[PDB]
Design a protein around this ligand. Structure first.
Ligand SMILES: [Cl-]
Ligand SMILES: [Mg+2]
Lengths: 210, 33, 4
């Protein structure tokens, strides 16, 4: 059964039919500051929440390639949700991929870790940055993406990557005024296009306010 | 090679049992069915 | 907030 992890924003959660889905990949498009990395940091904490509070009751794994992982942000989100800051940090496993080979190798370690402890989320920010001969890189990336799908299938974790299989949800983020941001989703038998506004704060992703 | 593995956000190295790695050795194979 |  699927678990939907809260993004911290009621509007964004509604757009996502509940939140970030375990068992599949959510691919977010946008540059740093559009909210993609902020969403990742928020999810690394909310995935630890009790299921009734919108969490996945599991640990988070964060593979960074940009050098933008910030433990202090996790502490702020933890305080916001009334969670132990120390426990939250101990429950987020982090690694920085040095190159594309390392990026893929980390998935083997990830799989071993998921056998030992319960994880609810795997973040890869960014899944493509290190890839930017050409055909060789494209095949390697394709393999990497299929491996992520296998992990989601095998362990039932939500896989969120920043930058497709039928189960992949693609989110296109853009800047709004000030701290507000907009997320847009496409081709949906329910609606051709749908959008939701959210905000990035010191303590994570929240709803946009006037 | 601490730089190539995982650490908790609090800076603690994450230990992985050799058996655990062995158990998932074939997880990513795309063998013909 | 900054919402218009
Ligand atoms: Cl961001
Ligand atoms: Mg969802």
């Amino acid at each position: 059964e699927i678990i939907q992890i809260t993004t911290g924003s009621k509007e964004l959660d509604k757009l996502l039919q509940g939140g970030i889905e375990t068992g599949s990949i959510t691919e977010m498009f946008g540059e740093f500051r559009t909210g993609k990395t902020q969403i990742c940091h928020t999810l690394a904490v909310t995935c630890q929440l009790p299921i009734d509070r919108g969490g996945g009751e599991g640990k988070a794994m964060y593979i960074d390639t940009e050098g933008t992982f910030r433990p202090e942000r996790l502490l702020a989100v933890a305080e916001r949700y009334g969670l132990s800051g120390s426990d939250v940090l101990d429950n987020v496993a982090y690694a920085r991929a040095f190159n594309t080979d390392h990026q893929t190798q980390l998935l083997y370690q990830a799989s071993a870790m998921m056998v030992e402890s319960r994880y609810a989320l795997l973040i890869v920010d960014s899944a493509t940055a290190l890839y930017r001969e050409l055909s060789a890189r494209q095949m390697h990336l394709a393999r990497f993406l299929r491996m992520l799908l296998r992990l989601a299938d095998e362990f039932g974790v939500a896989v969120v990557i920043t930058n497709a299989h039928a189960s992949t949800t693609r989110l296109y983020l853009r800047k709004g005024r000030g701290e507000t941001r907009i997320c847009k989703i496409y081709d949906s038998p329910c609606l051709p296009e749908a959008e939701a506004m959210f905000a990035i704060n010191a303590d994570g992703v929240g709803d946009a306010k006037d | 090679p601490t730089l190539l593995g995982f650490h908790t956000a609090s800076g603690k190295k994450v230990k992985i049992a050799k058996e655990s790695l062995d158990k998932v050795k074939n997880l990513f194979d795309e063998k013909e069915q | 907030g900054s919402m218009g």
